[PDB]
Symmetry: D2
Subunit: 267 residues, 4 copies
């Protein structure tokens, strides 16, 4: 069923990746934490609908930890899109539906803007576009702390702040949380400062390929208000889905329903 | 300071009203509960900025409870707008800034659509427009229950669902909560089933007068998402202010700052 | 089934009281708030088991608030016991089971100590014996504040501090909370400073009559730890029943089961 | 500094142990999870008071998991006491103060009952003595589930149920939580069926050595009510300390103050 492997890109990234199913390609880009096990529960549900689903740990994170520092420092949506294109090319994928949340969502936008020939349709979720607007207060200062306390402020927050199902978030498992531990400071040093102003949100870029922009049902309106305003002004289908920042974690069944339903409209 | 009185208008409504300050007129329309004491803390702060602030209990609610049944049964935004115009005329207010949340917001829009000559600028907050767009549990069924259980289901829900400031929600005082208890079943019989369909949200009505549409910063996105989409597509300035459904209760200082700042742009 | 009245005893207290049922007498003494509507749901369930249940508002509180200041200032367990004896005499009760929580529980203990001829068996719940028993807020300080802020510190804390069944706490209804609001400053001025030192907890006094001492199952252990230690060292049957400080509000059915079961062992 | 090593005892247990400081011996036995990193913050604070502190992971758990199945199946307080005696002998500790919570507390009691010559004074906390003196699901059924879901109900419950300082509980770190993951199913299969009944709580056993029995300040009264009743009836010093089930995690400083003060009274 699920297959796992490791492979290297000309960039020097040693990716860990997972695939399951057959049919049209769906690519699940993780959020900033870069832990693809968050997709573990949804993927089977997606693949069962007649799709081959692919995911991977992000460069420098979890089992993709063997990567050059430039791939997880000063990170931009454009660089992440290039990395996704690389791993995706190496996996002999031609053209695909892309899901992404947070920085991954930014990546999705960068994929729509700059590689439209490779996208059937895009699904971004809660894209950060402002300095500080991802959880609550400025993450952009967390880099000043020592690693242990960075991981401790981060793993102490994710449950109530956005991943608001303690049994599911914790159902990710202990090996995954141990990897996320080491992911937190790398994310804080490379993902908060640089990602927000790089999400391509211009009308023409958002319109190049079919785009379904979503927001967490229980997320406070102010966090990703700008997403809604931008999408609706650009004419992008914008909607809410159950959960907050990790709909695939807190509500895997509704996440797969949304993924499949949207993908089916653009086959 | 605060002046209070009771007066009858031609509809047969014996209004209770409050006024404070001097200067341009600001009218604070209550939410569906119709209890104007929720504005008690904000009003002084607004009036201190050089404004005459007027509020009142809604027909059939609290100290305006002595009113004909049609004024609080099968309630529509149009009926509420006519009642507000009546009380505004008798207080001989010519033209005013109007604030309204929920049904009051629906009233404000109805005031923009059908009485634009009387409105200087409008402020609606969290306008109900759908049978499902509400952070409760299908209000439109509550009318089937007994009065006591309607009021107790009511008073248990808005404190965390609609205010999220328990000490502030509760500082309203017990005479006010005593009125609100008796308001709850009347609200359930007359405000959930008829009011959502009646808010005029067409572009043409929304553009007649200056309009600042707001949503609670801490409201989860799905509750009034439609408000955001509609306002942004129509070109209406839309933003978030601290609080949820009762910003004047949970966050009075920022509520008055918002009211004053917006009103000052349109004198 | 319920009968209500008012009557005056020799102290000058104008009591409000309620009675229901027939059979052996059970008297439910309120907690410090002195609001007998907290027993509204339990009483019927007790009365249906073949008992006439009597309750009343405490002197100076709710509908018994027309009372001399001496009856609700510098309050002691002994004074409360004498008042309860007076009201019971006027109601032509000779002999009865007594329930009491907090100061009422203190009253029960004093009734066991000084009026053993009048009680068949006693039930006290979470009797305060120390200064500022509650962990977080020092009740012994509330008297320094003004009435509004006292009532707001009170009505705002009891719900999660004392009941943790919010839907039950307010189904008490509007009038009950309206009375309790005004009860708070009187309780704060008269009940935290003097009641804890007056509970008769000597071995011989606790043994004069059958005594079942209870603590809320969900109460933090330290709040009424002393109750457990004292009762168990004296050989008094001590157990917990569902709820915290207001078991008759949060858990009426198990409260009535406990009252009936214990009373049934001593007719 | 803290010293770390591994060693083998006659039972076939590959123990991981930690030691710090000099002076009289204080031994900190883990709760059922058997993870001694929970003592990481307290130990230094104890050592600074002039004590050599020793702790270890319990057989079959965390870094002591390489152990024969009999040491973590059908676990009794007596077996755990014998294992603890083995590890203390191997570290050539003669006589010491022992702290223990939950099963570790049961062990402490078993050490007082059956090895009193080795105990300076004993400190047990929240000893399980019944199959049902908690709130929710019967722990004795958890073994019927698959390991992943066993770990998932455990890690999802204790943070708010037993160890309630989420920032501290999570401050344990991810390597520790990764070990605790694999600890959960072994605990469920070997610790809840058999342990509650093996704690020696008879008066004669409890009096053999100085014993201070404690309960969590914020623990609900019903969880370890039996502990309070038993200790008070036997004449054992019984008191509350800040926290719930993991005081050394949630409130390390006061845990260390308690350990040191009690130990110093019996040096």
């Amino acid at each position: 069923m699920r297959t796992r492997s490791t492979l290297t890109d000309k960039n020097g990234i040693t990716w860990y990746y997972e695939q399951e199913g057959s049919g049209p390609h769906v690519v699940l880009i993780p959020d900033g934490l870069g832990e693809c096990h968050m997709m573990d529960k949804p993927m089977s549900m997606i693949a069962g609908m007649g799709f081959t689903c692919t995911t991977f740990d992000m460069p420098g994170f979890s089992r993709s930890w063997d990567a050059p520092p430039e791939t997880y420092q000063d990170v931009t949506a454009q660089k992440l899109a290039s990395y996704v294109i690389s791993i995706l090319d190496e996996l002999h994928i031609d053209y695909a539906t892309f899901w992404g949340c947070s920085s991954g969502g930014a990546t999705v936008l960068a994929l729509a803007a700059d590689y439209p020939e490779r996208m059937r349709n895009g699904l971004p979720h809660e894209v950060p576009t402002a300095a500080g607007p991802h959880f609550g207060q400025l993450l952009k200062l967390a880099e000043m702390e020592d690693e242990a306390i960075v991981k401790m402020l981060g793993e102490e927050m994710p449950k109530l702040g956005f991943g608001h199902d303690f049994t599911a978030w914790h159902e990710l498992g202990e090996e995954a949380h141990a990897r996320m531990r080491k992911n937190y400071p790398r994310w804080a040093r490379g993902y908060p400062h640089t990602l927000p102003l790089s999400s391509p949100t211009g009308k023409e870029d958002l319109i190049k390929r079919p785009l379904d922009w979503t927001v967490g049902g229980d997320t406070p309106t102010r966090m990703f208000f700008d997403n809604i305003v931008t999408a609706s002004k650009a004419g992008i289908p914008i909607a809410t889905l159950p959960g907050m920042h990790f709909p695939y974690v807190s509500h895997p069944e509704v996440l797969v329903k949304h993924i499949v339903d949207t993908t089916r409209k653009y086959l």
